[PDB]
Write a protein that binds this ligand. Structure first.
Ligand SMILES: Cc1ccc(NC(=O)c2ccc(CN3CCN(C)CC3)cc2)cc1Nc1nc(-c2cccnc2)cs1
Ligand SMILES: Cc1ccc(NC(=O)c2ccc(CN3CCN(C)CC3)cc2)cc1Nc1nc(-c2cccnc2)cs1
Lengths: 304, 304
């Protein structure tokens, strides 16, 4: 029983975090085999953030300009190259703690764990979702760049996010581990801002199923809706459209609770139109959209 | 920017988790130096949960009745003893991954990280608070007993909680690592239930400070209250009394925001009496009480 924002255990990633210094800029890197990955803006100056040409900036660097430290051990840099918005620093030692890993790119609406680090040292772990507008609502301070987001499946770490910047509304943007930004953001100084966002409908439905499995039932009703009629309501309240694939993905949770997806959609319509009338669902007075169907199945009992 | 329920990185504890089997019962244990700690109810049967005498049950066990597995490695048990509600299994190998550690007992209102484990294998990490009634609102399924709660300060893991049971309302109870239960609960079958709970006032105030530091200010006002007048309102809404020591503990956050504690108490009084009128604070429509002042300082910027 219970339902929490639960991250993956972080030990496999902790053993990969290093400190990268270039000039007077320090940030975090990810050490896998004999390569350290970090944001390329580590090579920038304050006089460079206006209109940087990173190809120029990197040609003017040598391996000796990069100081890499793993705990109390200095790693010797023997090669450097750019890949999109990340830097690859080849080092003379393979990381003995390298887990089985993959570099994946995630979709908006999917979740992952973030290991927030400062000066190469892990500080905390929390769960994040990629928003529809390709930002994340993280918790990061100055020094956190190069912190990573990941999921773990059996023994394998799938890295999906490296942190690069904070936008003016306080939300965060970054890249996959190939250095390609999520969303229409760049690693330079501009007036860039998060675009309009939407609520992740399939996740809200998953979380209503989690609530039923955990004994909250007050929002259920005897009505069922059609998919087209539900999607008219979704549009009005700035929810994403629900697809048949979403309905299919919710199949296991529907079977376990015996509540058809379009039955639960009729509950969600009533919550959107009427509010909660002073009640809560899984300790929240808002509809929560940062749990995927997978997250719910992973955490919740499977009985029925 | 941002504010998340953030756990401590879990790697130091992951390396301590083992599987303990006795008969057909499997649960988790904590392997530190050459001792494995686990709930003593691992030695129980279904015909024993009524009125167990654990001293009798343990006298009838031998070391060979305990199977301990660390990953794919079986640990040989060479001694067993009871300490209050935990069992200490002496093994023939010290854990090479033992961190610096302490066994601490926490106070109601304090927070800690939980590493949820199944079959000796870590599954997820989340943040928990000890409620005033000595329960925790965790996320645990069958098989999770023996999972631990902890905080980390510099290199040192302070273990404070071992999981033993789920109460009828879905909340959880357990012991410190000396085997002494938090609250009026026992590791046998009774009608025991969580007692009445209260909201942790100093934590709500800390979280309002976190909100101000993160730019939410709509709930602020020009009024200040007295401590006695605030505590009359606290009583009415089932909040704990605020003490001068609480005011002192909030000193750093008050100085950083320039908002006196009794000024912020006047905001909290208005929120309690009027609600939020459709607005949110740090993405919540409820007043959140599971962040301590320390948690806020640890996570939030320190500027001002
Ligand atoms: C996207 C980006 C692009 C360039 C930079 N770098 C800089 O602005 C910068 C870097 C280094 C310097 C110092 N110079 C270079 C070193 N030395 C020669 C002195 C002069 C001055 C400015 C940072 C970022 N990203 C940032 N992320 C944050 C941040 C804050 C809070 C949460 N998450 C991210 C702050 S700045
Ligand atoms: C407090 C307590 C006391 C005794 C027990 N153990 C049992 O009830 C029990 C243990 C073992 C058996 C099997 N027997 C012994 C082994 N073998 C001889 C077969 C017969 C039957 C029952 C469990 C607990 N705690 C439990 N925690 C949970 C639980 C569920 C979800 C979340 N957190 C905890 C379920 S039972």
């Amino acid at each position: 029983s219970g339902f929490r924002k639960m991250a993956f255990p972080s030990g496999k990633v902790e053993g990969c975090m290093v400190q990268v210094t270039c000039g007077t800029t320090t940030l975090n890197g990810l050490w896998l085999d004999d390569v350290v990955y970090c944001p390329r803006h580590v090579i920038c100056t304050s006089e460079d953030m206006l209109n940087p040409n990173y190809e120029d900036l990197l040609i003017r660097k040598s391996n000796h300009n990069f100081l890499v430290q793993a705990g109390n051990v200095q790693l010797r840099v023997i090669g450097h190259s750019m890949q999109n918005c990340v830097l690859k620093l080849k080092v003379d030692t393979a990381n003995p703690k390298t887990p089985k890993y993959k570099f994946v790119r995630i979709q908006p609406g999917q979740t992952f764990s973030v290991l927030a680090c400062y000066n190469g040292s892990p500080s905390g772990v929390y769960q994040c979702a990629m928003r529809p507008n390709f930002t994340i609502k993280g918790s990061f301070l100055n020094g956190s760049c190069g912190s990573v987001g990941f999921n773990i499946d059996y023994d394998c770490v799938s890295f999906c996010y490296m942190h690069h910047m904070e936008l003016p509304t306080g939300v965060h943007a970054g890249t996959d581990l190939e250095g390609n930004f999520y969303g229409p953001f760049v690693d330079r100084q501009t007036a860039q801002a998060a675009g309009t966002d939407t609520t992740i409908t399939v996740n809200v439905l998953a979380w209503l199923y989690a609530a039923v499995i955990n004994g909250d039932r007050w929002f259920l009703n005897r009505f069922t809706t059609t998919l087209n009629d539900f999607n008219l309501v979704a549009m009005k309240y700035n929810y994403e459209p629900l697809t048949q694939d979403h309905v299919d993905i919710l199949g296991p949770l529907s079977a376990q609770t015996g509540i058809a997806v379009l039955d639960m959609c009729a509950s969600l319509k009533e919550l959107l139109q009427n509010g909660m009338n002073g009640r809560t669902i899984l300790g929240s007075a808002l509809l929560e959209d940062e749990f995927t169907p997978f997250d719910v199945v992973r955490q919740c009992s499977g009985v029925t």
